[PDB]
Amino acid sequence: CTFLRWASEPEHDHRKRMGLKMLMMMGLLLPLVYAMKRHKWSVLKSRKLAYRPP
Amino acid sequence: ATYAQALQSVPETQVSQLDNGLRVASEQSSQPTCTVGVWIDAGSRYENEKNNGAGYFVEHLAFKGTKNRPGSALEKEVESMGAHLNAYSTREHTAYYIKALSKDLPKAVELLADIVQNCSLEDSQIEKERDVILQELQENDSSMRDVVFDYLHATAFQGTPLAQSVEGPSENVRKLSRADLTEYVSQHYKAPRMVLAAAGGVEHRQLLDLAQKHFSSLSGTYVEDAVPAFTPCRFTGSEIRHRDDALPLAHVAIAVEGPGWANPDNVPLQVANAIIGHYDSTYGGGTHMSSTLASVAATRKLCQSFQTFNICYAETGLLGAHFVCDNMSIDDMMFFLQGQWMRLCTSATESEVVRGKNILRNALVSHLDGTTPVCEDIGRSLLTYGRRIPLAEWESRIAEVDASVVREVCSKYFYDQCPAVAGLGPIEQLPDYNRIRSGMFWLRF
């Protein structure tokens, strides 16, 4: 059964290996990119508007 | 007689110092007129929130009355010899100067002593003076240039005393009292921070001997112990936008943290500023002015009054531009003006640096024409620098700066530095602060 599973999915090893890397770097890119967004979007998030009609 | 020889002549600024602390400084050349004034070091910088605006009120009430000259009698004297007494109060310095004939010098110094020392500060004049300031506040509200620079100082030096306006919020002026003003006078109008100045037919010995027998009563001590110290200010790169579509034009001012008075980087930066230059719709130069931004503006009729500035306080200053354009030009101008700065930070050329040096030389020389500008220079220089900078030294510093120096100083002050933009009126095309900071760096570089 293991052999037949390998026959069906020869990439079974490499796929998983690739997935591992995708888990790590996207665990790294996702915060920093988010950290970038809040960085460049903070101007709008700290606007503190004011109204002064006559 | 070439330029250098004329610069050498440059009658000197002999400076003295009487015991109490007041330092006299005169500049006699030939003229029968004179401009004698004191330059007390005070302003909105030395003012807390509770009493913000006291200095303007004091300058208002200075000429109104004195213990010696009862009331408008002081005005009667000043107009008797035709003198033009005047006073200006910046954020750092507040000065009184009399423009009068040299023969009437003995009387003028006596008049200055009365105004700056024996001021009545009478309550009824305070009440009457209150209305004038409030109306003056509305007039300055209509001063669509001034409110922009006030917005600049408020949005750049937040929290610090520098953000405070000179006149003061229209709530301290409605709650001030003789007590508050008397503390301002006692804590600021003191001999060490006072520069008696004159220019014209004023012998330095005359100014010294008059100061000894008129101004020696000024004290140097400070009440119990309280000495108003110096509070360094911080440049918080920010943005303020007062969107008011009714206003026809859209004043915008953008500046970064420029140097202080002592920093020599003033000399190169000014040259760089002179590169950008100034323009008004009534100039006449048109699409032929050497300044690239001026040529573009005149070609496409973009702005109406753009002009650079170098507002420079003791420890920090504002360096940048202020442009007045219609609603659908700001987005373009913030592209060009910034696009100019980066050029100076990356590809300044000695060909234009020579032009900037010439413009700076002419500005310095022409500004020092007439007795009153000379007196202003003396009073301001003895405070900001501690000595009147001779024009020869200015020439030397201007000779030192070249293309490499201008590039380096612009990169050190302009490149990648957060601005302090401040809008007014129908500002909508005004790019968001993210865009303005984006323009502060060039991806080619």
Q: CA B310 to CA B321: how far, in whole Å?
A: 9
* CA of A41 vs chain B CAs: smallest distance (Å): 9
Specify whether the CB–CB gap between B44 and B52 falls below 8 A: yes
Nearest to B181 by CA among B133, B229, B216: B133
Q: Please tell me whether residue B269 adopts helix, strand or coil conformation.
A: helix
Task: Show residues of chain B in contact with A40, CB under 8 Å.
Answer: 434
Name the strands in the sheet holding B84-89, side by side, starting at the edge strand that comes first in the sequence. Answer: B23-28, B195-200, B33-38, B94-101, B84-89
Name residues whose C-beta falls within 8 Å of residue B313's C-beta, 6 or more positions apart in sequence: B45, B91, B92, B162, B233, B260, B261
Name the strands in the sheet holding B317-325, side by side, starting at the edge strand that comes first in the sequence. Answer: B240-243, B422-425, B250-258, B317-325, B307-309
The technique is cryo-EM
Q: Please tell me whether residue B286 adopts helix, strand or coil conformation.
A: helix
Q: CA B263 to CA B105: how far, in whole Å?
A: 36
- Asked if the Cβ–Cβ distance from B433 to A43 is below 8 Å, we say yes
- How many CB atoms neighbour CB A23 within 10 A? 10
Task: Show residues of chain B in contact with A45, CB under 8 Å.
Answer: none
- Asked if the Cβ–Cβ distance from B433 to A40 is below 8 Å, we say no
* CA of B160 vs chain A CAs: smallest distance (Å): 19
- What are the b/e assignments for B215-225, b being 16+ CB within 10 Å? beebeeeeeee
Q: Which residues of A, range 1-40, sit inside 8 Å of B by Cβ?
A: 40
* CA of A29 vs chain B CAs: smallest distance (Å): 23
Nearest to B144 by CA among B280, B257, B242, B44: B242
Q: What single letter denotes the amino acid at residue A35? A: A
Nearest to B59 by CA among B132, B145, B144: B132
> For chain B, how big is the Rg over CA atoms in Å?
23
Mode of pairing for the β-strands spanning B250-258 and B422-425: antiparallel
- Asked if the Cβ–Cβ distance from A40 to B432 is below 8 Å, we say no
Nearest to B65 by CA among B120, B141, B129: B120
Specify whether the CB–CB gap between B410 and B348 falls below 8 A: yes
Q: Which of A43, A46, A51 to mutate to test the interface with B (most CBs of B within 10 A)?
A: A43
- How many CB atoms neighbour CB B208 within 10 A? 17
Q: Which residue of A has its CA nearest to B237?
A: A43
Termini Cα distance of chain B: 46
Q: CA B51 to CA B169: how far, in whole Å?
A: 10
Q: CA B17 to CA B200: how far, in whole Å?
A: 20
- How many CB atoms neighbour CB B88 within 10 A? 14
Specify whether the CB–CB gap between B112 and B118 falls below 8 A: no
Task: Show residues of chain A in contact with B434, CB under 8 Å.
Answer: 40, 43
- How many CB atoms neighbour CB B431 within 10 A? 18
- How many CB atoms neighbour CB B204 within 10 A? 18
The count of CB pairs under 8 A between chains A and B is: 4
- How many CB atoms neighbour CB B341 within 10 A? 28
**In residues, how long is chain B?**
445
> In a 10 Å sphere around its CB, with 0-12 CB exposed, 13-18 middle and 19+ buried, how is residue B373 labelled?
middle
CA dihedral angle for residue B391, residue B392, residue B395, residue B401, rounded to 10 degrees: -120
Number of helices (H), then strands (E), belonging to chain A: the values are 2, 0
Q: What's phi and psi for B167, nearest 5 deg?
A: -70, -40
Q: CA B97 to CA B372: how far, in whole Å?
A: 8
Specify whether the CB–CB gap between B255 and B309 falls below 8 A: yes
Any bridge partners for residue B250, and if so which?
Answer: B325
Q: CA B310 to CA B318: how far, in whole Å?
A: 6
Nearest to B74 by CA among B29, B32, B125: B125
C-alpha angle B348-B352-B356 in degrees, rounded to nearest 5 = 105
> For chain A, how big is the Rg over CA atoms in Å?
24
CA dihedral angle for residue B115, residue B120, residue B124, residue B128, rounded to 10 degrees: 20
Give the containing element (helix H, strand E) for B423. strand B422-425
Specify whether the CB–CB gap between B49 and B164 falls below 8 A: yes
Q: Which residue of A has its CA nearest to B435?
A: A40
Cα–Cα distances in Å, from B397 out to B347, B357, B412?
22, 10, 19
Name residues whose C-beta falls within 8 Å of residue B360's C-beta, 6 or more positions apart in sequence: B267, B270, B271, B274, B398
Dihedral sign (CA B285, B289, B293, B296): positive
Give the containing element (helix H, strand E) for B80. helix B73-80
Q: CA B90 to CA B165: how far, in whole Å?
A: 10
Give the containing element (helix H, strand E) for B99. strand B94-101
Q: What single letter denotes the amino acid at residue B220? A: G
Specify whether the CB–CB gap between B220 and B20 falls below 8 A: yes
Q: B59 an active-site residue?
A: yes
Residue B248 is encoded by which pair of tokens?
């026809």
- How many CB atoms neighbour CB B392 within 10 A? 13
- How many CB atoms neighbour CB B280 within 10 A? 15
Specify whether the CB–CB gap between B251 and B145 falls below 8 A: yes
Q: Which residue of A has its CA nearest to B238?
A: A43
- How many CB atoms neighbour CB B400 within 10 A? 12
Q: Provide the H-helix boundaries in B233-329.
A: 266-276, 292-300
Q: Encode B352-418 in three state secondary structure.
A: HHHHHHHHHHHHHHHHCCCHHHHHHHHHHHHHHCCCCCCHHHHHHHHHHCCHHHHHHHHHHHCCCCC
Q: What's phi and psi for B325, nearest 5 deg?
A: -140, 170
Task: Show residues of chain B in contact with A43, CB under 8 Å.
Answer: 432-434
Q: Please tell me whether residue B23 adopts helix, strand or coil conformation.
A: strand
Task: Show residues of chain B in contact with A54, CB under 8 Å.
Answer: none
Q: Which residue of A has its CA nearest to B243?
A: A51
Name residues whose C-beta falls within 8 Å of residue B213's C-beta, 6 or more positions apart in sequence: none
Q: CA B294 to CA B281: how far, in whole Å?
A: 10
Task: Show residues of chain B in contact with A49, CB under 8 Å.
Answer: none
Specify whether the CB–CB gap between B88 and B375 falls below 8 A: no
* CA of B434 vs chain A CAs: smallest distance (Å): 7
* CA of A42 vs chain B CAs: smallest distance (Å): 10
Residue B413 is encoded by which pair of tokens?
């002050």
Q: Please tell me whether residue A32 adopts helix, strand or coil conformation.
A: helix
Q: Which residue of A has its CA nearest to B438?
A: A40
Task: Show residues of chain A in contact with B432, CB under 8 Å.
Answer: 43
Nearest to B13 by CA among B363, B260, B311, B380: B380
Interface of B with A (CB under 8 A): 432-434
Any bridge partners for residue B97, and if so which?
Answer: B37, B86
- Asked if the Cβ–Cβ distance from A40 to B434 is below 8 Å, we say yes
Options B12, B27, B47, B59, the catalytic residue: B59
